[PDB]
Structure formats: structure tokens, C-alpha cells
Amino acid sequence: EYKLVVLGSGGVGKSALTVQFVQGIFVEKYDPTIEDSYRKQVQCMLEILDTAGTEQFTAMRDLYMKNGQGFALVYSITAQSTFNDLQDLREQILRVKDTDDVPMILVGNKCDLEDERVVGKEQGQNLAFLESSAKSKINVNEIFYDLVRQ
Amino acid sequence: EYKLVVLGSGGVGKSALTVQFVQGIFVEKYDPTIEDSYRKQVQCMLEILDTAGTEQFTAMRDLYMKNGQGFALVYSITAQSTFNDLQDLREQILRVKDTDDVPMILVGNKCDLEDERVVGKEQGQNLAFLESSAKSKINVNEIFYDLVRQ
Amino acid sequence: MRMILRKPPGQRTVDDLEIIYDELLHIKALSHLSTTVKRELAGVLIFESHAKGGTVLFNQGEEGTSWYIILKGSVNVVIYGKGVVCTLHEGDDFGKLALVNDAPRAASIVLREDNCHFLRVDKEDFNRILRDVEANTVRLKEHDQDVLVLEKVQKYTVMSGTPEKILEHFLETIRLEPSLNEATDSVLNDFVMMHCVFMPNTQLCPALVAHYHAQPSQGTEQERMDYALNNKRRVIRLVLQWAAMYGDLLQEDDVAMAFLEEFYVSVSDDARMMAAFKEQLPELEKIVRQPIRGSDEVLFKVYCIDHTYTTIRVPVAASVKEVISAVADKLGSGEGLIIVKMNSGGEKVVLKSNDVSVFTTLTINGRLFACPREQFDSLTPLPEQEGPTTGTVGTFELMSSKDLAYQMTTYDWELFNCVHELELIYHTFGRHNFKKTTANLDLFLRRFNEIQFWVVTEVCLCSQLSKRVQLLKKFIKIAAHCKEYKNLNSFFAIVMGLSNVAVSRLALTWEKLPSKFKKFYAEFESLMDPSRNHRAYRLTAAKLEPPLIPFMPLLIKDMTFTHEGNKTFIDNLVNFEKMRMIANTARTVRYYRSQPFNHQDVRSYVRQLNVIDNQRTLSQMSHRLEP
Amino acid sequence: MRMILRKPPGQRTVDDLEIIYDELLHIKALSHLSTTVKRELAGVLIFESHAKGGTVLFNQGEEGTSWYIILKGSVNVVIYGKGVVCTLHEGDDFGKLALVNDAPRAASIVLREDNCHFLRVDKEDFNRILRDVEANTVRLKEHDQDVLVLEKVQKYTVMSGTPEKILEHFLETIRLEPSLNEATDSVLNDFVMMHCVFMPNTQLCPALVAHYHAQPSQGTEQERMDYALNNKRRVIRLVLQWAAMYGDLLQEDDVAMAFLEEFYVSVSDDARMMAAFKEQLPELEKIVRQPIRGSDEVLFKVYCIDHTYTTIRVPVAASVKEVISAVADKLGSGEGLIIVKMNSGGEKVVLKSNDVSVFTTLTINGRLFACPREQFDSLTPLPEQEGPTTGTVGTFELMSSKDLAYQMTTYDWELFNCVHELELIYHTFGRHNFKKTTANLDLFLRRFNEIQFWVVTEVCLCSQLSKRVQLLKKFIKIAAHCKEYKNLNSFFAIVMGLSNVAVSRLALTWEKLPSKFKKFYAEFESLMDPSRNHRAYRLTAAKLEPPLIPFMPLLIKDMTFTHEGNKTFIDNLVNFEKMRMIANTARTVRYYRSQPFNHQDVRSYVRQLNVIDNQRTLSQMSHRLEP
Numbered sequence A, B: 001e002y003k004l005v006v007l008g009s010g011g012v013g014k015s016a017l018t019v020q021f022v023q024g025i026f027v028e029k030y031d032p033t034i035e036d037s038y039r040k041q042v043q044c045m046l047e048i049l050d051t052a053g054t055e056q057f058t059a060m061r062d063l064y065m066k067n068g069q070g071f072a073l074v075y076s077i078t079a080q081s082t083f084n085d086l087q088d089l090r091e092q093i094l095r096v097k098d099t100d101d102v103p104m105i106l107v108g109n110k111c112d113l114e115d116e117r118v119v120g121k122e123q124g125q126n127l128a129f130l131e132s133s134a135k136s137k138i139n140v141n142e143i144f145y146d147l148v149r150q
Numbered sequence C, D: 001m002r003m004i005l006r007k008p009p010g011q012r013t014v015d016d017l018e019i020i021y022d023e024l025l026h027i028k029a030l031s032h033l034s035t036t037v038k039r040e041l042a043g044v045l046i047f048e049s050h051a052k053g054g055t056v057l058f059n060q061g062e063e064g065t066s067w068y069i070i071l072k073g074s075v076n077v078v079i080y081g082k083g084v085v086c087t088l089h090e091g092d093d094f095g096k097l098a099l100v101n102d103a104p105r106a107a108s109i110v111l112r113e114d115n116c117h118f119l120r121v122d123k124e125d126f127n128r129i130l131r132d133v134e135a136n137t138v139r140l141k142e143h144d145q146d147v148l149v150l151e152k153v154q155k156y157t158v159m160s161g162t163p164e165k166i167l168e169h170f171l172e173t174i175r176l177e178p179s180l181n182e183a184t185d186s187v188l189n190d191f192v193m194m195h196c197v198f199m200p201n202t203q204l205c206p207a208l209v210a211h212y213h214a215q216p217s218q219g220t221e222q223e224r225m226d227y228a229l230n231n232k233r234r235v236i237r238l239v240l241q242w243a244a245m246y247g248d249l250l251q252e253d254d255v256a257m258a259f260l261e262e263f264y265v266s267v268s269d270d271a272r273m274m275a276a277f278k279e280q281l282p283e284l285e286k287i288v289r290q291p292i293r294g295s296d297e298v299l300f301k302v303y304c305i306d307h308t309y310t311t312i313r314v315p316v317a318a319s320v321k322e323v324i325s326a327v328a329d330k331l332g333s334g335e336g337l338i339i340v341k342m343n344s345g346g347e348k349v350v351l352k353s354n355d356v357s358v359f360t361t362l363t364i365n366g367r368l369f370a371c372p373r374e375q376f377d378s379l380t381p382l383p384e385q386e387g388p389t390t391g392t393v394g395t396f397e398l399m400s401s402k403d404l405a406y407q408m409t410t411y412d413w414e415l416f417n418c419v420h421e422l423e424l425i426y427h428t429f430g431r432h433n434f435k436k437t438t439a440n441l442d443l444f445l446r447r448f449n450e451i452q453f454w455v456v457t458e459v460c461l462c463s464q465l466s467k468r469v470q471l472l473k474k475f476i477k478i479a480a481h482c483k484e485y486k487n488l489n490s491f492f493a494i495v496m497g498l499s500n501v502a503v504s505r506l507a508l509t510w511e512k513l514p515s516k517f518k519k520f521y522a523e524f525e526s527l528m529d530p531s532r533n534h535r536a537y538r539l540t541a542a543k544l545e546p547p548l549i550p551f552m553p554l555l556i557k558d559m560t561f562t563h564e565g566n567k568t569f570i571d572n573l574v575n576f577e578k579m580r581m582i583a584n585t586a587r588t589v590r591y592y593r594s595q596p597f598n599h600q601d602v603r604s605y606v607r608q609l610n611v612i613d614n615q616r617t618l619s620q621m622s623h624r625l626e627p
């Protein structure tokens, strides 16, 4: 039993990453209302606790931070703002469970679209790091593999 | 609930008539070992108690005569002997259930093959009468319809 | 052989049957069927021949009595108002859909050429032999493209299609018999709710008028008259369901209002002249906290960097571009304003010109600023955003736990009943795609945060340790009464307020709480377990009966992942399987609200909460209560 | 697109998947699959290309790891010892059978031309997506005819095929692992038992020798050596099962005895030279009332019209033609004899020259006559056929009910164990088709009538009403003890004797019977109810455990209707579904006899019954006991 948490601002691609990992978009219909909606066997059983859709409810992210053992901090390399939104989530993680260290990875999502790119690999590298794409399925599984390793 | 009985010598076509009525040969596999093997809904539920295969066990035909309410006396119009075998079965019917009258029909089976014919329509007519064919499915249902009418 | 296949089923001999079966093996339409199935069909399949091109096998609207395979020749699939939509050739089969769904034929089938041969299987034989075995997708085609895809999920249901073909499907299959009222309405509901995504009123309304006036191209005068009359009764039925789904929302749509007004005129004229629509005409005549409407006007303050403000007066559903233009009217500017939302903690978001109805999407203490881009980093929050500095314990301490929870639940029901089901769709697929407000949903969602921050605010403003233990106790009781009233939303809001970092920090307060209430709370907390898709919450709500307020954040999450998890279009066709998934989630809400829910000082308090929503402020306050 | 289809499954993007799916819709091999199934396959289907004709996809004997669809080009299906058996073209699929049955490939697949393209789905993906959906019959073909038809009844089982292809199938799928001994033998049993109907030893023995010496036409030297070694172990296994099924019946078949003797020489020579067959060779070395054999000689009396007779000495399995010729040797005739069976009641049946082993098919008191046809109507029965005129009550009255029933059941077990399972097959399909005796089955079937007529005889020969009530009582007790010993056959025989018209007539005797035994009997009688296919009997026998003697007339009826109800050949192929149905009925007998069963005067009596079987005589006697 593991519990990984997906964090970041809206429009970053958290929900896409979550579905693309646990099942896959378009190959199967996705029903988010069933006991196994966010559980995948990987030899470990992972639940993905994702904040997509509930970012306005800060109690929701705190509840998941409390239960989360690994953390993905996702931004869009097409957006400035989302990258800058990242310092605070990292900080809030250390506060809810009362600790010092927590396993986590920084994710630069949407890497496939580079004619719209405004953040560089460098900036994310300066800031575990991965440049991924949920839709292009680049580095989707890797994200959640790293966190079981941490 | 009805109970019809098929009688006559061996090689006459009793079993063929029975299967051709209750289900059909070749359209479906025939399993004689199940509760509904000889039952057909027709609005009445008929069981066919057939002596095919058990002619050497006279107690078997007596047991069926005891339970039977209608009777088919079948011969092959390719055989002399089988026609002559018929007087006695008629007599044995009146003896087992202790009665005077019993509903029954005389059946001249195998009517399709007439280059092998040795009994005539006349002889059977002299002797309810039907010239039938189990394989050519001529008059199969009629046989058992007549008996519910009687 | 044709003789054999012409013989009635019951007249086929054992060797006829054998000969037929061997020929069945050379037929590609039967190739996926078992040996068992094909020997059964040997006794039941009919050979049918017709000499003349233009011969009619069956007509649109008729009962489905047969399934066919073409052996020789070709047929036209003919639909009223479209002519020949496709042609089927040797090896194709048709007629299965009507048979299996017990629905009317959706097309006529007409011989395209002289001398066509068919294998036909009639209904009772098809249902006993082929119903769960002849399981091929039904793919309806028009000008060599799929237009409707239906599958066994027992009937074939719509999986995908074009907007027009989906409408045509749902229209035709309407059953008008009164004993079927509820069943018919249920079948229409997915389309009626979800059409805004794939067939907006601009397209749907003209389609409905066109369908209303449709006439058959085949049949005697009486048959034609009867077909077209029932067609009109079917269109009217759909309009009635469509009108009912919108209710008061129709006023926001001028196209839709104009359609319905003219449709009412059409039907009342036709009712008179045709002596029809006796039941449906009066139904239609009827149709021709209070909810906020997109056309309601707001007086809204928009701030400058120097903390002066402009008051604009614009529709609730105004776009950001419309806000900017209104602000420029009053400041007399041409200096490139942007609109930024600012939170009490100083967190800033630039809004897009595209964004609509943004007023109700501010955080509890959020404000809207207008400024040139160069001012973005220098904006600072207003004192009024920072919340109260003194408690209100002296007021609500003197109020019963039960009265508070009841007045909370009453207000929560007004807010929840103000939310139109369509707002859930608009919110999920994105407001700008519809240019509709979700103001009611927005304010109801914000209530969850207000209650939560109310808890944290009052605890953190309570200096005396002893009274603070009594606060913890009273909130735990308020929550218990909320859960008893089936207000699960406000129950979790209090529980989560109690879980906030600034409150859970207070060991001296929690340590001192009677372990009776420590156990109550520990249990409430376990009900929030996210484990196995919130199983603990899910099963809890599942046991409850209609008048309930669900845990709203999880509803929004469900909707979000339904939308993101599933493609709206599949091969350029509407993914109707996705449409039903979304519509199911919204009917869950309809179910929660299907039964009604059964002290002016308590009322006024509960409805006028003033709250700190700056988490930094609350943690600073917490740390000085208990270092 | 080929790039896309070449990308590993996990590297396909959402738009790759969409593009792939739209192309899947143009593939006829997937046309019967759901939308749901085809979008799953979009992420899993592999595109495979090969440039050169003669390229090998897989070899005969290998594990089934993939299912294929041909997109472009063609392939040869290649089988050791037969070369190219067929060719598959664009649109055909192959490789499903090995995958699903977890069996070895039955053929190699070789590219027939340059540049062939394939869609491939690998095993774990096939089993999760396609296993209960890709349900097409497997039809193996050779020179454009079906040779094997297999279906899901979870594996594909053989429904029909040619004798040679069925043998090849059952040989190849033998599993040699000791942990699978019972499972492997069970799978072979239908073929091993039923081959006499469709592949007699004259054909099977040469086929087995040919298979024993078969060599692969592909592979390295070691691979070829190993294949051919395991092939030989598989043939040996089948021969061992075949030999065991016959047991002592092999002596009746000179072809089969000669085959097995030479096969033993082959295997012992090969064992030495190849250092193989360490376990199987000794097993094979072993193989290289008592039952009557077809080659046993009988001394049989054949009567003239004047009631003199000839004694002939002929094999038990002699045909009627052989009987006639033996009689003519002793009467020195050339005057056209016919053989007629005559019953004690004077009923006569002319036998056909064709009939074999007729001696044991006479009624209890039947005799055989030889005569010119002109004498047929004038034949009259012999005094010795008419049975006893005095009872034996004074003998068996003094014997315990329990001792009688036990000695009866002991004798019945000797008779029942004398019947070889193959006699049930020969009896069902007709003795002349095999020229085999069913002497043991015949005598065991006649025992049912002997017991039945014993009852009627003793009741009808008992003049004193009082002692006759005691007889009725004692038979009812004998029956109860038979049913306790699980001898259901002899139990029903007594019950049915008691039901005979001549015994049931005797109201003064039944009226006088203690109602304790009236109730016992009324219950026995209900157990015989023919209702719902003898449900009362069927369920009774079903509850019992192995050492039991079933109700034999119903077993014969079951077999009769299995044979008459079902065609032996379907489209010139063996109907193997029928073969299994017959074989199941015979293994029911094997089960009944799978556990052993656990007073010289009683023994001698029970084994030397003298009986009246003339129903007229018995009714006449009955009527004068009680008018």
C-alpha cells in the first residue's frame, strides 16, 4: 500500500497524468467514481491522490498531504506563473504531517509543445527533475516510479 | 401434463419420431439424460414415453402402458413382420390399466421410401391412421396432435 | 436448394438441413457464429427472392419483424427527408437494430436492382437463437461515414454519433403511451441535459422546427397522415422535456425563447386545424435566496493600485473584456488594463479577456483589481481583506448547538437549491464555452470554505485556553447535528476546520478536551479517509435517503475527472458514453434534492459570517496562543 | 503510421491511439468486436513487417505466444509429413488455437511471398482483451476442406474432424509430465474408446506406426532430435492407453496383436539405441464367472421342425451365415435354410445372414430353429421352452431374505464385471458393424428378465392363498435388501415382477398383505415413475457411491437415444460431440464399478433359476388361482 499525491496549479496537467498512469486516456473509458479509480499495481499497490478539480478547497490538499507519502510538483513549461506557484506547496507539505523530510519530484509537464514554451529546462533544473508530457506519454510512469524509490 | 407412449417392433422408427418431435435431429444435439429430454410444450406439456431400445424388457413397456394416456402403434411399410406384430400390443394395453377404451393411432412410418415398399396404404387402412416419415418429417407432429385430441 | 430454403422450417428433412448447413458455411455474415448456432439456423433461415428493382422490403416507422442477409443484388437504405443514405451489397446484413431494441425501423429498405436474393430470420427465431450471439456493433452510415454507433451494454445503446443522427434517434424512439411516461422521459434525459455540449440551441432549435414539419415520402394518405401526426407528438414531447430542463434559464437564451414562443403558435394552430394535441397543448401553454441569473446586474467595486476603486454596473455573466471596458468608461482611460484577482494573502492571478462571470469565483476575502501590466508585482491587499481581529464567541456561545446546525442546514439548502443542474455542466466544460454564469454553484462552493475558515477564525481568536476547549467541544457538537440533518457538506467543513494546521497545533487545548469528544472527532476524521476513492465517505452517503447535501468537493472532483479522463469526440463523433457519465453525476444531485428539507438571532448570525481566510495570519495567531 | 504501430504500446500518444483506432475500423478480422474492445487493442496491437519470402513466423511444436492478422501478402501453413496444407491471405488471422488452449503450435507458418505485413497481439494482452470475445470457431483446413473444427464449450474442444486429423490432435496435445498423468489419460479417453466407430485398428495401427517414425522437417540437429524423441514418447503413451482399453479383447484382433508385438520390438530396440523410454518400456512389456470371448467355442443345439436337433460347434462370434453352413455340414443339405428364433409363446423372428453372435440374444426360454422358408408358419415351440409346472417355495422359503439378496448381488456383480465397456459401444452401433460379440452384456441384460419372471413364476405356481401372501412379503424383503446392497438392477426386477399383470391381479393376496409391506411396495413402485425422464430413479442412483449396479434398461435406453438422436458424421466429418456423449455414458458404468463389492445352498439356488417366461401361461395360471 502506497499513497502518492499530485500537486500544482490548475491547467498544469495533473488529472491527465493521473489518468494516463492509472489506466490510459481513450483506450478505456475512465470512471472516477469506483473503489479502484486511482489504484494501480506496479510489486506495489499505489493510490494516486490528485488535487485536480479541488484546488480552491485548501482543506482537500491538506487532507491529502496528511495521507501522502510521495509528492509530485507539476508545472507547465508553457507557463511562468505555474512555475512560480511551486515554492509554497513544498512548504505546506512540511507543516501538515509535522516532519523534516518527504520524498518528492519536480515535473515540467507539457514538454512536447515547444513553440509555446516560456520556461526552460535550466530554470526547472536550477529549481528529482523530469520534463514530461501526459498526452505524448513521455515520462508518465517514471514520475511515479521515482517516488516509490524515494 | 400429458403422457404419450410410442410402441412397435424394433427398426420401425420410434426413436426417430420421438426425437424429431421433441427437438429435431441435426439442428440440435440430443441429450437423452436430462429432465426435459422427452418433454415438449404444445396449450399442453407432453412427455413421450418411448419403448425404443428397451423392447426386450417387457416390464418397461408395461410400466409405460400403465402411465400412458395415448398410444402410437408404429410399423414400417417396408416390413410385413412389423405390421403383423401390431395386434398384440393393442391387446396388452387393455390389461395393464384395467380398462375398455384407450386413445390411440396407427402409424405407417417410412412412407418416403417406396421402391422398398411391401405394405400398402390399404392394408394399414383396413387395419386413426397416418402414413408418416420421421426422417422426411412427414406427419411427425400430427401423430401426437391427434392423441391429445383423443 | 431454393426449394429447400423456401420450404417452411417445419417441413425440412434431415438431409435438407445437412445440405443447408454446408451452404451456411460459405456465408461470411455467419462466419463468427458457432457450429451449434449455424445448425439451429439451418432449420429456421428463409430464402426470399424478388424480381423487380424498387420492391420494398419494409418501410421506415414499421415494427422490426426480420433480420436479413443479402445473397444477391443490392438495396437502398431510404430515410424521409434525406433520400438514399446508403446502399448495401452482397454479404451485408440489415434490420437487426429494430428487432433487438423493439424500436421502429429508422429507414425503409428498397431493392436497388432486379432479382435480389435474401436470407431472412424472423423475430421469435432471432431472439431465441441469435440475440446474445449476433453481437456485432450496429454502425449506421450516411454517404460513407458512420453517423451512429450502438452497442450492447438487453438493448443496443448509443455509443457515439453525429448531433443530428443522435437527435433523430432519440426522437423516433419516444413512446407516447401514458404507462411509459417515466421510462420515455428517462431515455430522453441524457440528450436533453447534455446537448449544450454538442448541439447548442442555435443548431437544435432549427432542427426541431424542421423535424416538427417533416412529412413521410411513402404510404397511403391515411398512413402518411398518421405517421406525420405521431412525428409531431414526438417532437412536442421532446420540446416539453427540453423546456423543463431549462426552467427559468430559458430567459437567458433569446434564440430558445423565440423558438418556443413560435413553437407554441405552431402547435396551437395545428391543434385546432388537426384536432390533435389535446393533452400536450395545455402542458405547453403553462411554460409560455432566489437564484442569481446571468442577466441580473451587479454593482461591483474594481480597485486601483492606490486602493481607490470604480463601481461598475454590468450583467452577472459579463466577460473580463466587458469588465475592462466598463472600468475604462469610468476612469476615462486608453492605458491597457488587466484584471487581477487578489487574495487576502497577497496571491495574484491575471484573468483572461475570455473569462466570464468572474465575480463569484473570488476567494472569500478576494478583491478584483484593474491595472496596467507594469503594476502587477506592486499590488498589495486591502485592510478589508484581512478579516476580523476580535471573536464572536460571546454571541454564538449563547446559541444552542442544535439551533446553529439547523439554521446552517436551512441556509445551505437555500444555496444548494439555487444551483441549476446545468451549472454543473457549464462549470465542468468551462464557462467561456457557453458564456453562462455558474454564480449559484460558485457561491455554494465558497460556503464550504467559509464554514471551514469560520471554525479556524473563532478558535484562533480565542485567547483563554478554557473557553477554547469549550469552542472545540461546541464545533464537534455542531458537526454532529449537521451530519444528523444529512448535511454532509457542512459537517465535513467543520471537521476539516478542526483539522486545519492552526487548530491541530493546539495540544494544550486538545489534551484538555473530554475524551468523549476526542473519540467523536477521531471518528469524524476517519470518515474523511481518501482511501479506496473515499470509500468511508462514499458508503456513508450511499446509506442515506434523498434530502441530503453531499460532500461538494468530491462531486466537483468526480466531474473534473469524468471530463479530463474521457474524450468528448471519438473519430469526429460525439462520445455519448462520456455524455451519459456526466449526466449520471448530475442526476445524483437531482436525487439528493428530490425530497424537501423539514430564532432570528441564530439565523442572522449563521448567514453573515465574517472570516479570516489568510492562512499565514491564522498560523501566526495560533503560535502566540500556544508557542 | 507504421512508425506509430511500431512504437511500443506504452509509447503511443493519445492521438496515435485515435489514429490507430480509425484504421482498426477498416479491418475485417476485427469487425465483430465491440468499440470497447477495439480501442483497447489500439494500445496493444503490433505492426510486423518482413521482407523475404520463406521467413518463418513460428514453427510446429513451439509455444503459442501470438495471434496474427495478415495485412499484406500471404503465408503457408506447413506441417511435418504433409508439407503446405494451406495458404492464408490478406484478411485471414492465425495462431489463436495454441494461445487459447495453451497447446503446442500444430503447424509452422512461413511467408509465401516477399514483403508481408502483420498485426500481432501477444499472449497476455490477447488473454486480457480477446479471450472471451474472439470467439470464432477454429476451422483447420487441408487442400480446401475442413479437417478439424474446434469450439469453446475455457478451451476450444474438438467438435468434428477427419479420423487422421483427430488422431494428430490428440497425439500432439499429450502432456508427459507425471503431475499430469490423470489429466492426460482423461483427455485421450474419448478417442481411445470411440475410435472403433470411426478409425478401426486396420487404419489406426498403420497410422500409429507412421506417427512413431515421424521426423521434423525444420530445426537444428538437437531441436530435431528432441522433437522426434518426444513425438515417440507421445505415441507410446497413446498406445499404452489404447492397449489398456482393450485389455484381453486384443486377442480377438490379429491386426492389433501383430501391431503391438512389433511395436514392442521397435520401442525396446529404440530404448537401447537412444537410451530413452526408461519408464514407458517396462509398462509396455507387462502388456506383451469369467468373461466369454468371441473366439470361445460353443456347442449349440439348432432345431428342426420335427424337434430333432443338430449340435454345432462354432465360435461365440459366429455370424448367422456361419451357423447355417455348420448346420448344412451336419444335415448334408443344399436346401436353403433360414435361422429363426422362437420364443416360448410361439413368437418367431427370422435372423439375417448378417447377424453375429446371436446365441446370447435369445429370450430366457428361446430356441434357434433352422428350416426352409416354407416351414416358417408351421414351427411350434418345444415342451422344454414352457418352464416349470411346480414351485420351489419349499426350497427358498427356508432361506433368509438377506442371504438370497446377498447371493443374488454377488452373482449380479460377477455378471456385470464380465461386461467390457466396449460391448456397450458394439451393442449401440450394431454388432455386425464390428463382427464382435456382446455375449457378456447380453447375459447380464437377460438376468433382469430372469429375476422378474422368477417372481411371477413362483407367485403363479403357489396355489395356497396363505403361503402366497408370505411369498409377496418375502420378495418385498428380498428387493429391500437388494436396494440396500446398492443392486438397483435386481431391486427393480423384483419390483417389476410384483407389478406384472398376473401378480397385480391377485387382490385376495394383496388385500391380505400387512399394510407395512403394502407401504414399502407402494414406495418402491413410485421410484419407477417414468416422470421427467425417470427423475425418481435418476436422483436415487445419483446419491449413491461407486459400488452400485444401475437400472440397466434405462442405461440401454440412454445409449439408444444418444445414437439415434445424433448423427455420427456431420459434413462428412466425425461428429466428435456425439462420440463424447456415448463415451460419457460408458464412463458412468466404469464409475459404478470403480469400487469392489464387499451358504452353498443359497448360492446354487440363486444361480440356477428355472423360469416361465410365457406371459399367456402365467396369466392363465393367475386366473385359476383367483378367478
Ligand SMILES: Nc1ncnc2c1ncn2[C@@H]1O[C@@H]2CO[P@](O)(=S)O[C@H]2[C@H]1O
Residues within 6 Å of the ligand: C056, C058, C059, C060, C078, C079, C080, C081, C082, C083, C084, C108, C109, C110, C217, C218
Ligand atoms: N419504401 C420507400 N420509403 C421511402 N421512400 C421511397 C420508398 N420507395 C420509393 N421511395 C421514393 O424514393 C425517394 C427518395 O427521396 P425522398 O425525398 S425520401 O422520396 C422518396 C420516395 O419518393
Ligand SMILES: Nc1ncnc2c1ncn2[C@@H]1O[C@@H]2CO[P@](O)(=S)O[C@H]2[C@H]1O
Residues within 6 Å of the ligand: C064, C077, C079, C085, C086, C093, C094, C095, C096, C097, C098, C099, C104, C105, C106, C107, C108, C109, C139, C140, C141, C142, C147
Ligand atoms: N444511416 C442509417 N440509418 C438507419 N438505418 C440504417 C442506416 N445505415 C444502414 N441502416 C440499416 O437499415 C436498417 C433499417 O432498419 P433497422 O432495424 S433501424 O436497421 C437498419 C440498418 O441495418
Ligand SMILES: Nc1ncnc2c1ncn2[C@@H]1O[C@@H]2CO[P@](O)(=S)O[C@H]2[C@H]1O
Residues within 6 Å of the ligand: D056, D058, D059, D060, D078, D079, D080, D081, D082, D083, D084, D108, D109, D110, D217, D218
Ligand atoms: N518453418 C518450417 N517448418 C516446416 N517446414 C519448412 C519450414 N521452412 C521451410 N520448410 C520446408 O518446406 C518443406 C515442405 O515439405 P516438408 O516434407 S514438411 O519439408 C519442408 C521443409 O523442407
Ligand SMILES: Nc1ncnc2c1ncn2[C@@H]1O[C@@H]2CO[P@](O)(=S)O[C@H]2[C@H]1O
Residues within 6 Å of the ligand: D064, D077, D079, D085, D086, D093, D094, D095, D096, D097, D098, D099, D104, D105, D106, D107, D108, D109, D139, D140, D141, D142, D147
Ligand atoms: N490444417 C491445419 N492444421 C494446423 N493449423 C492450421 C491448419 N489450417 C490452418 N491452420 C492455422 O495455422 C496455425 C498454426 O498455429 P495454431 O496456434 S495450432 O493455429 C493454426 C491455425 O490458425
